[PDB]
Amino acid sequence: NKITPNLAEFAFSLYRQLAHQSNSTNIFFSPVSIATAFAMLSLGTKADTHDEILEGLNFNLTEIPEAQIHEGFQELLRTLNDSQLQLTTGNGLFLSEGLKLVDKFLEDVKKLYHSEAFTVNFGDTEEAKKQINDYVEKGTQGKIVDLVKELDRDTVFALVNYIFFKGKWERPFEVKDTEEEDFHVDQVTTVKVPMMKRLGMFNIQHCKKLSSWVLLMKYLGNATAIFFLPDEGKLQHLENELTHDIITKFLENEDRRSASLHLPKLSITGTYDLKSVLGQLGITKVFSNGADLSGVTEEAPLKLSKAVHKAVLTIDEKGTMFLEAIPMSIPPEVKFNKPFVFLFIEQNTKSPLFMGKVVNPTQ
Template sequence: MMTPFNSNGLLLLAGLCCLLPRTKTDYHEGVYNDSNIDKFQCRKVALTISNVSISLYKEMAQESRNGNILFSPLRVIAALSMLSMGDQSNASQHILEALKLNKTGLPSAEIHKCFQYLLWPILHPPQSSLLRSGSSMFINQDINLLDEFLEGAKKLYLSDVIPISFTDSRKAKAQINNYIMKKTNREILDIIKSLQSDTSLVLVNYIIWNAKIISNFNCKFVKMEDFHLGHRNSIKIPMVNSVDVYHLFRVNDLFSMVLIYSHSQSILIYFIVPDKGRMRAAEQRLTYPHFRRMVQKLSLRMVKVHMPELSLSETHNLESVMNLLGINYVLSNDHISSVIMDDKVENPSKVISKVVLTFDDKGAIPSSTSCLESSTWANVPLFQLNRPFLIFIQDSDNYAPLFLGRVVHPRN
């Protein structure tokens, strides 16, 4: 007889409940009680971010056809949207148009409020959460920020604002790196590699997720297995073999099998594994409506899964990221100066986004390698993440896209 499953933790990645483990009380704290925020309208903003993120991903995929890609759409778009606050020129509207946020039909003030709503859960998780995220803006101490921008950066985008002297670029770089190192408990080191002495602003966004792989059926073990990199190349990596309850189905027009992990606290994690040799075709066809249609296919079933231990870290300079979308003027000095500063400044600005994502088996109690050979699991389908795959992580309460990427090498 099959062991009954527990509704509080159904899935292989139940350890990911720590991603955003909100109780009902926690969830409605603070901004979630703000009657001035229209949650339905804010979902339009989240859906727009998701659509833009797919376009951005496709551009990244063209630039890096055979490498890992990983970024946080919510963090990237929020950083750029924050720079649109201010009324001294048309720069604000230009930025919102570049990010397609004008298509929501909302006034800019409401869009900024929606970012407060969308960012709140990841910037105020419980102390026990394995997710950490933050935004820190280092501004030249001789520059006067517009009051509206300063208030909005702190209140709406929940960003630290730190005056700093850039005269000694080496000292400024060390100060920024030490600040981020302390904020992230040493998980992000040396995020700034170089800095000019005439820099006027440095904006750093980061999101870190350390997840534990577990099995709710006490059937899990780690085995060294092949991960196929392509072109007949493979590497041996630790692969967690386990069994649990998932949503598993095929999406024919993406040539892919899809495994979805869902959680009662509104997190959806999509693992999309294209058929051999069809990754590029799947990427070209991928649209955000695919994810919306996938949700309609949700149907829990027992699945045996081989999940690689992942250790991924990506850093993006947002100027180069936005250049991929053909909107390089957004981060021009003229635009930034007119939007956030009292006086026009010709000095350069830097906007950095850092993503760290790990899945591992550390700290978990292993079970026997024979557990999957039990007759209990004889007819359970097998899903193997043993070749390049796509990953998408979403807060399904507000549709905010937290992570999007492609895993080609699980240990880079």
């Protein structure tokens, strides 16, 4: 898994920037789906436009060959796309119908990255926006609606990237045990949220280096959820100390201990303007009039005017008979009833499927 360290650093860079934009909103995004879409876009770019994209995905081009970058993304798409992981992801390229497209690019999009490319009359902005939104709604079975709200008048190329995940816990909660509990949005304020609870044997530990409880729970399929519960006043310290090697140590641990876990039910979405967010990471040329997109079309100028990512997560008790031996001893009460951070990891590749922060489940 040669590109896994780069995906992890891209996940942290992308998280740390969003955490700086707003500190009072829930965060949820797919680092893998965003990186895949732009690694695929780089196939149609050249020169500085190409180099900026891969460097913005935390790939040092003086160290890793491009053949290994695309090989890693292709292998990751194979495992994700049989699986019990109820993961639906899609990437849509919408190009002006007047453009003469390069066949090599359209082939690479479908054959290698299993994505979709469409022609659209951007001379009718309202109809172009309706066709883009009907594509995402059909691909999500109605979960994501009216994704694109506006299009620039000179739009000739738009990119949408969507992903929805509803996992099935390997060791599930009991619906009868879910009850309304306090969630401490700050140190003196609470709100009532639906809270799942179960007594079991967990991959859980209090990490001194992170000043947080670290809980790992396995989904059906090859994906593991990692939840970080920071100690009092240690949320920012937790966000600063997260490194990929720290995640690797957690995933390798096989020790289990008893705990009374309280975990909120979550229905969370995240919608992000990738032109703005990735521009803060150094990806600017492909969104500008100077973009080298000669691998997509050769004669006419081309720039990516619109790029949107939306991610939807649902966490529930079951999602659709392991028996754990519980010792005769007081189990610690681990309650995710205050702001926490999480990261979902694909088991085979160790790649960060999702990352987010919950500041208020019902916000």
